[PDB]
Amino acid sequence: MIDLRSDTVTKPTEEMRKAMAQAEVGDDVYGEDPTINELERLAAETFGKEAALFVPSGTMGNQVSIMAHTQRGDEVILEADSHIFWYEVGAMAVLSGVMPHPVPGKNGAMDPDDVRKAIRPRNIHFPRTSLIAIENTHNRSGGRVVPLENIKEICTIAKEHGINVHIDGARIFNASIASGVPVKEYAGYADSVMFCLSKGLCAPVGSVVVGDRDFIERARKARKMLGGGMRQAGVLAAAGIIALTKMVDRLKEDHENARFLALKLKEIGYSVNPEDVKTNMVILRTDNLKVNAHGFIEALRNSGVLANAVSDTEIRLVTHKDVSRNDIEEALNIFEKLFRKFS
Amino acid sequence: MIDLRSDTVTKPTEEMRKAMEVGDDVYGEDPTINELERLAAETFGKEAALFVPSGTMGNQVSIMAHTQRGDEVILEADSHIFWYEVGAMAVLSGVMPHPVPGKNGAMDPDDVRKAIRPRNIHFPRTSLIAIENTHNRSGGRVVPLENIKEICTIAKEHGINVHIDGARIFNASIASGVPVKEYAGYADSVMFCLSKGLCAPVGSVVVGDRDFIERARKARKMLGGGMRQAGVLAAAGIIALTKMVDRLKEDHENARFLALKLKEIGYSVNPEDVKTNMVILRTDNLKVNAHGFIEALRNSGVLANAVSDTEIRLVTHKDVSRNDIEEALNIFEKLFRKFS
Amino acid sequence: MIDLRSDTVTKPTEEMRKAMAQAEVGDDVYGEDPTINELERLAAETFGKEAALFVPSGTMGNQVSIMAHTQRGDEVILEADSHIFWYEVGAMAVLSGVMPHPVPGKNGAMDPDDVRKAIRPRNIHFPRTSLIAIENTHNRSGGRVVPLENIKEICTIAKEHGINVHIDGARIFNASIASGVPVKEYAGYADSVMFCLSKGLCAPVGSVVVGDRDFIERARKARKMLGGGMRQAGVLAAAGIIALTKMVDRLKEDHENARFLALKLKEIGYSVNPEDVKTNMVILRTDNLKVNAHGFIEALRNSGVLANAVSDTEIRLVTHKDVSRNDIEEALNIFEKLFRKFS
Amino acid sequence: MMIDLRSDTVTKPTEEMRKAMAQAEVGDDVYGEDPTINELERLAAETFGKEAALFVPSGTMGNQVSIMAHTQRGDEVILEADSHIFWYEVGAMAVLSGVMPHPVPGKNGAMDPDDVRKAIRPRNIHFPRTSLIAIENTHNRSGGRVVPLENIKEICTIAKEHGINVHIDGARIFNASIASGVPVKEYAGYADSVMFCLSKGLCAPVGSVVVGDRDFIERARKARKMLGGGMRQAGVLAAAGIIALTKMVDRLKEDHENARFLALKLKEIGYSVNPEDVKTNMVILRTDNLKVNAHGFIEALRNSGVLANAVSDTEIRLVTHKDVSRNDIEEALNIFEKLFRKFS
Ligand SMILES: [Ca+2]
Ligand SMILES: [Ca+2]
Ligand SMILES: [Ca+2]
Ligand SMILES: [Ca+2]
Ligand SMILES: [Ca+2]
Ligand SMILES: [Ca+2]
Ligand code: NA
Ligand code: NA
């Protein structure tokens, strides 16, 4: 089918499948897997950091980072619509015993003044603000790119207060492709960065956390506690190396396809705003249709297109490697036919 | 000094000092604690009650008794549980707060409904909604009974518990005319303070169903609130609950007078917003910010707390007489000349 | 009834009642209660430490100490039969996220070599051992006194590893009166000590934690989090000062009464060991009786004597200010009658 | 290269596994759409006679999500005093679940049922609630010892009477089964949940599986999401797991035969080992009759081409697995014989 549900559904490339088959492995618990070691070395190098740690998921990447940055009772400033707050099962409270301090943002960009104001003064009644998290290409807002200046401004505030900064860069390469800002530049204004290998980059499993050597050592211990300490994970790391080193540039194609899809959907008559499409996500409202988002998703599935409803009136369409321009053209033919039925 | 920092500074009345029969509460044998809890449960129309050393403990054992690890707790964005309880909900219960904006403590029921998490693997389970009555941060504002009723209805629909942080619920009752028993009927649990406007030296009480209170009592033991001959404290608590409620009206009168007169001097206050024992004073029209003005106030005989860089909270209580208020106003008058 | 269940049942003396009624108080949250401040000053001085913190209970005292000494995932070495492990509702795991590491002891004295062996090596699989707790006048062994030499040897081991030492001194003054070792000497070989005011010292409520200034500041914030931050607690502190300054010497009376009780129980024929009784507790075994401990407790209760069973064959008898020699004599007459019935 | 007797975790994928992983049919497991993971879980559930199963990236995660699903904050978990959950899982039970471990000493990994019974907390405000009893099968620390089915049966009876959950840390449960002749479904029949590893003796590169009732597995799956074990196209890993379960269990007998040979021969040389205690893939060697300690002996073995781990200042653990052949065992033995001349 034509899967526009998310970029998480990307499948391994033929190059990845071959590398997994001949991957050199070892027990990572002993630090003896050569491929995992190389993946971490490459990731550290790529983001200009001292060290890196491979994890089974972006969620674990964010959570081990929070654990490594905080102490029980601490508070973590984060954007009110960020993944760490909305889609990580309340893990920060259970695993680290910390409280989130949601700060509103405009498409992922928290006003530097609101962030500075959310920092807790030193008082017996108050938690200690020890971490500030920023999400780049903010998911909930529709894959928007957080301006480099916003990140730089918040980094300055953090520095003045002795507060750590973590960038949830699950889709940081999409941000870099859209903005022209190198990932090293983003990373320089953060103490840690988590980036996904299993979304737009097409690896089957995993993410990576990069940061200072001492922070990574603490995160590695947290990873062991959480259950992310695998054995011969080099099989996964082999695909990860290809994802990191060879699948970044083509993300531009996903952006082009998302924009083309949006422009054409608007032409048909669907409620979409092509001007809001900055990366690989398109938000489709169903207010003008005879059925709501849930009913329209079912009609789409019957015609060969998969998508998710994110509310009763909104559907999200996400492009990726496994959605070609031909697939986009085919999907548009289907959307055209469904508009005749449901407008 | 003229202490306007909080109503927590109230000292025991002579009758409280004399009242302060005991036993070991761990064995449930302190008769005065037992009578205090019996009286509290009766007053709020609940099955059981639990004495605790502080309102923070009262709120926290209630959260522990209402939730499981990983749950989410809907609460007002400027509520005490979120801002002034040291992140205890995350450490003690492993729960995540889900702040919802409110207008003077009143969360729009529709916003509360939208904050409830659907059943999905990525989401915590919303198991509790907390409402703070006479919302501190907004100036000791009274949350409308209709707001609480509506939220209770939503909670019922979804099978979610409701906890009322009633640290100053009697102040609310006195101002609104709504009996505390009526407020409590729309909640599963209520925590109310004995150590603030009611003048007891120590403690608060949590009221609710018998099974919830049993869970809260075990949580209290875990937290370290299981005392021995606490009847010494309970004796003052009974007097606070049974003899000190009516006079809260005097604190409201003094707060309103203070606010009215401060407005006349020229300070940035809103006398029409003052319905209980608190006055929010803004410093945007002064030459110094809240922290600087608090220091000046201290040097002239007046104690108050800054609640932000531009806001000061003034609180009245039994130990601040009308004469004290008049004396404070003379001081505020002099300081307006200096910093305006 | 004649209460031998625990020394927690002690009621305030007339002196304490007057002091509580006349207590000079203030708001302790602002550090303004003069009586709490004097009690803490006196407590610190008495234990030879720079700071102290009054708490509502010994459990809170131990738990805030654990919170202030550890970080999530740490391990706490403690005696296998200690109160922190058995009677504190699993608080160490919930509040501090730490693991207990039980070590056997002989009457509360953990073999120093066993303690050194229980310290975890630096390995990703292992928690960090950051605290060693020692209980003085170890309850479960029968109110036994831990030798100063034992604490001294453990202190040296702790210093070598950079590990903190906490003494659960709930009944430390009973230990001091029996051994002749000043409480400041026991405390000199520990980082922190918690002692109770509400047991043998007769105060109605509370305990105190003593230690270094930084540690106490962290313990004070932990106390706020747990809910032990009270307002005009000077009412309780007034009785606390009398407990500390005027009720220590008379503990020797409780020790004398416990010894007399044990000797006479042995004379009657009960299975007791007077040679093991050096403080205010007597362990009585029901081995030679036609009933188990629980059934014996019931028989005692029906005859006017209260006590607790500590196992299916052992019951604990505890003396205190509120059980006089006359009461011990009357209890013995009852014990004599019951021995004829169940022996 | 060196003879690695450090652990069975070092097993490398077989040629068949490598091909199945690279060519695995995958999908997004978060949506429950990876066909290979789904088949691995179906097969695992069936093998253990349970309704459901959950793939996890490690045995530690398997145990921890099970503890999370079986307990509430403040609960106590009875477990053997030398078990992996207590010693080698980074204190995770306290941090993740807020539960207290209640160690019960065991005899060769087996806790006496009456000691388990006595460890259950009475209902009292001072005591945590005992909600889970964990049993480790082929108990590692004692030397890969096999816990009898009757021990597990008796504990199950006690747990049922008290309404307590039972979890089997079956990291090496197939080793127990091969040695005892007891099908794994029989061990599992006396437990609410069982975690078993695919990445040790079964030779898969990554992961373990938890089996149990549908509702428990659903709760464990949500715990897995929270801990970060919710992967995407994990079918790549599951492909090797299916082969581990279907083709690598019977040969564990070879690992046991190799360990028995190793022990018998080490005894003949003069080392302090007990061949009579060796029934699975582990041999405990004490250094009591050597003029060196445990760590020093490990260093000497390393210098001679043999890798092992010290588990005490006087104990070393030798583990056999697919990647150590009988010829490798003979080589190690010949070296052990000589190093016996140097250190005795
Ligand atoms: Ca993927
Ligand atoms: Ca007061
Ligand atoms: Ca007492
Ligand atoms: Ca007499
Ligand atoms: Ca392996
Ligand atoms: Ca050979
Ligand atoms: Na911590
Ligand atoms: Na729970």
Q: What is the CATH number of the domain that holds A277?
A: 3.90.1150.10
Give, in order, the Cα–Cα distances in Å from C309 to each of A97, C6, C282, C284, C335: 38, 11, 12, 9, 15
Residue C215 and residue C192 share a domain: yes
Q: Which two tokens stand for residue A35?
A: 């491929």
Output the CA B119–ligand 7 centroid distance in Å: 31
Q: Are strands B2-3 and A308-311 parallel, antiparallel or unpaired?
A: unpaired
| Chain A stretch 78-117, residues whose beta carbon is closer than 8 A to a beta carbon of chain B | 85-94, 97-100, 102
Burial of D338 (0-12, 13-18, 19+ CB in 10 A): exposed
- Tokens 């980074």 found at: D90
CA neighbor of A75 nearest in space, from A135, A127, A118: A127
Burial of B25 (0-12, 13-18, 19+ CB in 10 A): buried
How far, in Å, CA of C187 to CA of C165, rounded?
10
How far, in Å, CA of A207 to CA of A297, rounded?
30
- Containing H/E element for D266? helix D252-269
Contacts of D330 (CB under 8 A, 6+ apart): none
Residue ranges with strand state E in A126-223: 129-135, 164-169, 192-196, 207-211
Residue A119 and residue A84 share a domain: yes
- Tokens 């002891």 found at: C105
How far, in Å, CA of A6 to CA of B122, rounded?
15
For chain D, helix, strand, coil in percent to 5 are: 45, 20, 35
The Cα diameter of chain C in Å comes to 61
**Protein residues placing their CB within 5 Å of the ion ligand 6:** D 327, 330
Contacts of D57 (CB under 8 A, 6+ apart): A56, A227, A228, A230, D206, D207, D208, D229, D231, D237
Residue C274 and residue C240 share a domain: no
Contact A100, A153 (CB under 8 A): no
Q: Which two tokens stand for residue B82?
A: 């979120």
How far, in Å, CA of C23 to CA of C20, rounded?
5
How far, in Å, CA of B283 to CA of B311, rounded?
6
Q: Alpha carbon D338 to chain centroid distance?
A: 33
**For A30, which DSSP code?**
G
Report CA dihedral (D176, D180, D186, D192) to the nearest 10 degrees: -30
Q: Alpha carbon C212 to chain centroid distance?
A: 21
- CATH number of the domain bearing residue B15: 3.40.640.10
CA neighbor of C99 nearest in space, from C119, C123, C129: C129
- Is D74 in Cβ contact with B121 (below 8 Å)? no
How far, in Å, CA of C92 to CA of C63, rounded?
7
CA neighbor of C138 nearest in space, from C188, C182, C87: C87
The residues with which A102 forms a beta bridge, in sequence order, are: A78
Residue A78 and residue A42 share a domain: yes
Of B94, B217, B226, the CB nearest to D73: B94
Give, in order, the Cα–Cα distances in Å from D261 to each of A135, D268, D274: 58, 11, 12
Output the CA C107–ligand 7 centroid distance in Å: 33
Of C230, C246, C262, the residue at which a domain comes to its end is: C246
CA neighbor of A332 nearest in space, from A317, A321, A320, A343: A317
How far, in Å, CA of B89 to CA of B339, rounded?
41
How far, in Å, CA of A39 to CA of A242, rounded?
9
C219: nearest CA in chain A? A124
Question: B27-59 burial string, b = 16+ CB within 10 Å, else e?
Answer: eeebebbbbbbebbbebbebebbbbbbbbbbbb
Report CA dihedral (D180, D185, D188, D193) to the nearest 10 degrees: 130
- Tokens 């070991």 found at: B24
Resolution for this model in angstroms, one decimal place?
A: 1.8
Q: Are strands C2-3 and C305-306 parallel, antiparallel or unpaired?
A: parallel
How far, in Å, CA of B250 to CA of B244, rounded?
11
Domain count across chain C: 2
The residues with which C76 forms a beta bridge, in sequence order, are: C100, C131
Residue D253 and residue D239 share a domain: no
The H-assigned helical ranges of chain C are: 14-21, 34-46, 58-69, 83-86, 91-96, 112-118, 148-161, 172-179, 183-188, 213-226, 234-246, 251-268, 293-302, 325-342
Residue D76 and residue D59 share a domain: yes
Of A213, A230, A246, the residue at which a domain comes to its end is: A246
Residue D191 and residue D46 share a domain: yes
Residue D81 and residue D220 share a domain: yes
Residue D21 and residue D48 share a domain: yes
CA neighbor of D187 nearest in space, from D201, D198, D172, D173: D173
- Containing H/E element for B191? strand B189-193
Q: Are strands D282-286 and D315-319 parallel, antiparallel or unpaired?
A: antiparallel
Residue A153 and residue A99 share a domain: yes
Burial of D281 (0-12, 13-18, 19+ CB in 10 A): buried
The Cα diameter of chain D in Å comes to 61
Residue B149 and residue B291 share a domain: no
CA neighbor of D82 nearest in space, from D134, D40, D43, D32: D134
Half-sphere exposure of B304 (CA within 13 A, CB side): 29
Of C181, C214, C246, the residue at which a domain comes to its end is: C246
| Chain B stretch 201-260, residues whose beta carbon is closer than 8 A to a beta carbon of chain D | 217-218, 221-222, 226
Residue C254 belongs to domain spanning: 247-342
Q: Does B195 touch chain C (CB under 8 A)?
A: yes
The residue type of C172 is I
The residue type of B37 is E
CA neighbor of C294 nearest in space, from C314, C265, C269, C266: C314
CA neighbor of D238 nearest in space, from D17, D61, D49, D65: D17
Contact D194, D212 (CB under 8 A): yes
Contact B163, B188 (CB under 8 A): yes
Give, in order, the Cα–Cα distances in Å from C52 to each of C42, C45, D337: 9, 9, 62
The residue type of A268 is I
How far, in Å, CA of A212 to CA of A69, rounded?
11
DSSP D126-191: TSPPEEEEEEESSBTTTTSBPPPHHHHHHHHHHHHHHT-EEEEEETTHHHHHHHH---HHHHHTT-
Q: How many residues does chain A have?
A: 343
Residue C154 and residue C77 share a domain: yes
Q: Which two tokens stand for residue B127?
A: 């198991």
Reduce the DSSP state of residue A163 to 3 states and report it: coil
Q: Are strands B106-107 and B126-132 parallel, antiparallel or unpaired?
A: unpaired
The residue type of B156 is K
Q: Which two tokens stand for residue D300?
A: 């000497």
Contact C200, C254 (CB under 8 A): yes
Closest-CA distance of chain B to residue A115, Å: 15
In 10 A of CB A18, how many CB atoms?
15
Phi, psi (deg, nearest 5) at residue C165 = -125, 130
Closest-CA distance of chain C to residue B44, Å: 23
How far, in Å, CA of A10 to CA of A200, rounded?
7
Contact A81, A141 (CB under 8 A): yes
- Containing H/E element for D241? helix D235-247
How far, in Å, CA of D180 to CA of C204, rounded?
61
Q: Which two tokens stand for residue C37?
A: 């401040």
